[PDB]
C-alpha cells in the first residue's frame, strides 16, 4: 500500500482500549509500546515502531495523539489499520 503500508484488522470492544500507546513523531503517529495482556498484543498484528496512517478510513497521520485518543475511545467493532512497519 501507499508509503509501503499494510492492512491489519483488530477487534475492539466498547470502552476497552486495544492495549497500545501512541506518540507523535514529526507529523506522524507511532506505536510506542504494546501493552502486555491487551488485545493488541494477543492479536500479534500491532508492533512498536509501527506508524498509523489510517484507522477505519480516518487519516491518522497529521493528527495530535490526543485527537487519536478521542477517536479510538468511542470506536468499536472491526478496526482496519493502515500501518507502516518499523
Amino acid at each position: 500500500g501507499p508509503l509501503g503500508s499494510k492492512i491489519v484488522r483488530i477487534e475492539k470492544a466498547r470502552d476497552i482500549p486495544l492495549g497500545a500507546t501512541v506518540r507523535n513523531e514529526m507529523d506522524s503517529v507511532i506505536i510506542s509500546r504494546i501493552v502486555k495482556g491487551g488485545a493488541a498484543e494477543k492479536s500479534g498484528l500491532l508492533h512498536e515502531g509501527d506508524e498509523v496512517l489510517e484507522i477505519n478510513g480516518i487519516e491518522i497521520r497529521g493528527k495530535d495523539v490526543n485527537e487519536v485518543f478521542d477517536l479510538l475511545s468511542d470506536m468499536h467493532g472491526t478496526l482496519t489499520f493502515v500501518l507502516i512497519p518499523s
Binding site: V22, R23, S32, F69, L72, S73
Partner: peptide, 7 residues
C-alpha cells in the same frame, strides 16, 4: 518531551 497516550 513526548506524550504517550494509551488507546
Amino acid at each position: 518531551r513526548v506524550p504517550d497516550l494509551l488507546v
